């Protein structure tokens, strides 16, 4: 990464954002700038070339310009599905390709409370000697969420891991998965397993729990 972009930008649906790209006189200063959209899991896709030209298939919501040693990408009429990593690119003094560090676009939708589900470990896994307990936080906004595990009312600290999806292409929400890991012997020493969720969209913390031995198969 040679060119400098802001880490992230954000706005509400229908609004406009601009994404800056700073270089030097030897790259952007002397050479053309191009822009890419990279949706999660996919290769970068060309949005802009030769500073301001759109390839076939790219709508005029996307535009580019260049001034001195900096370039700018414009996106009007923001839609859900526009959430992605955006990259600028140009050529250095040796006429070799260089790229920016990327900018993640966030769509500022309305607050949505998460729906919470909890999954006891399967008997199948229990036979393998371990117990993974999974708590699901589905389709919420904004991203900030707090998940706290309790086992027979003991606060669990350090023995869980979580990951979060990118904004959904259909409703711009996030989802979160949290896994509490115990050994089989430890799992069978306790009854009550609980996941407590705190989020802006909830008037008070929500708890989902189960007792070991309630479920089968």
């Amino acid at each position: 990464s040679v060119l400098t972009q802001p880490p992230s930008v954000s706005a509400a649906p229908g609004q406009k954002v601009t994404i800056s790209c700073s270089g030097s006189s030897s790259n952007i200063g002397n050479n053309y700038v191009r822009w890419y959209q990279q949706l999660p899991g996919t290769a970068p896709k060309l949005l802009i070339y030769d500073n301001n030209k759109r390839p076939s298939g790219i709508p005029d919501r996307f535009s580019g310009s260049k001034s001195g040693t900096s370039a700018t990408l414009g996106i009007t009429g923001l839609q859900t599905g526009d959430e992605a990593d955006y990259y600028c690119g140009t050529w250095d003094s040796s006429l070799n390709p260089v790229f920016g560090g990327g900018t993640k676009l966030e769509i500022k939708r309305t607050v949505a409370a998460p729906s919470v589900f909890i999954f006891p470990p399967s008997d199948e896994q229990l036979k393998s000697g371990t117990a993974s307990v999974v708590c699901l936080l589905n389709n919420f906004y904004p991203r900030e969420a707090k998940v706290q595990w309790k086992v027979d009312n003991a606060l669990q600290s350090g023995n869980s891991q979580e990951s979060v999806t990118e904004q959904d292409s259909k409703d711009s929400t996030y989802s979160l998965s949290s896994t509490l890991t115990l050994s089989k012997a430890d799992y069978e020493k306790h009854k009550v397993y609980a996941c407590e969720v705190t989020h802006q969209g909830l008037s008070s913390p929500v708890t989902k729990s189960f007792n070991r031995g309630e479920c089968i198969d």
Binding site: F99, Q125, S128, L136, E162, T179, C215
Partner: protein
């Protein structure tokens, strides 16, 4: 025009990374240039090198002594050789070319750890929307792909980023929300593919008998 990377998901340190890019629907000798660009996990793009119309090559100066890019006219492929790799060479590698067309990219992990296939456990639904899923646990290296009902089920699906456990193995979950009324009639199968270990599993997820 289609570009498709092929190569190992895992390479030991100090060894040589070897990749190929199969070009479909276009002659490789009619290309302006063919090149490679990589992207470390969670980071930006880095150009590796390119080979041009004449066969002339240009490499990233910081990588030059370790990089070889050549063309197989008979196979209609070009390749990348990156010698003496270290963990710093762990990245998604893209092949590209101007007729520009990019490939899907292939994740290469440089590690002294070994390949391990995943176990697949159901996240079975129980006590008007129900959630269910699959836990894909203890594999190495990345990536795994998960689909549902052989692609027929996509609405409401969330496949989370894998987490690196302290054991050194990855774990991933994929979930989906469906109508509660469908649990007794609709079959839900998660299709798990871990290509580095050549492991594929189709796992049926059935409602738990909870009381």
């Amino acid at each position: 025009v289609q570009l498709q990377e092929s190569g190992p998901g895992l390479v030991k340190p100090s060894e040589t990374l070897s990749l190929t890019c199969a070009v479909s629907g276009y002659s490789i000798s009619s290309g302006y240039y063919w090149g490679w660009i990589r992207q470390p996990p969670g980071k930006g793009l880095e150009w590796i090198g390119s080979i041009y119309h004449s066969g002339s090559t240009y490499y990233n100066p910081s990588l030059k002594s370790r990089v070889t890019i050549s063309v197989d006219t008979s196979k209609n492929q070009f390749s990348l050789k990156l010698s003496s790799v270290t963990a710093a060479d762990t990245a998604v590698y893209y092949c590209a070319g101007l007729t520009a067309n990019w490939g899907q990219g292939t994740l290469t992990t440089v590690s002294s750890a070994s390949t391990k296939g995943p176990s697949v456990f159901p996240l079975a639904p129980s006590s008007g929307t129900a959630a269910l899923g699959c836990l894909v646990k203890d594999y190495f290296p990345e990536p795994v792909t998960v689909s549902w009902n052989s692609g027929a089920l996509t609405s409401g699906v969330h496949t989370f980023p894998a987490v690196l456990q302290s054991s050194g193995l990855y774990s991933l979950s994929s979930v989906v929300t469906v109508p509660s009324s469908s649990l007794g009639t609709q079959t839900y199968i998660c299709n798990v593919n871990h290509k580095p270990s050549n492991t594929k599993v189709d796992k049926k997820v059935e409602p738990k008998s909870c009381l």
